[PDB]
Design a protein around this ligand. Structure first.
Ligand SMILES: [Ca+2]
Length: 84
């Protein structure tokens, strides 16, 4: 559920950062285009993005509809202060 997802995501962000190449590249694109940098450092925002991607990739195939939906849902959630 949402509480669990957000906790996993924040912890992965702290622990894993952007150590996964595929997520790092996706997130480099997202920061450039789709996610504003204004509220948090570039590093913090990127690491949270990479966590979103790794979390979603743990359920769904990279670049599948479900993966895109899952990552967008988190990026669009106004409660992520770094993404807003
Ligand atoms: Ca930082």
């Amino acid at each position: 559920d949402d509480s669990t997802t957000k906790e996993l995501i924040k912890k992965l962000a702290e622990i894993n950062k952007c150590e996964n190449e595929i997520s790092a590249k996706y997130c480099d694109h997202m920061i450039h285009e789709e996610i504003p940098l204004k509220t948090c450092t570039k590093e913090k925002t990127r690491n949270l993005c990479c966590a979103v991607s790794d979390y979603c990739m743990s359920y769904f195939t990279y670049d599948s509809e479900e993966y895109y939906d899952c990552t967008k849902r988190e990026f669009d959630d106004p409660s992520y202060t770094c993404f807003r």
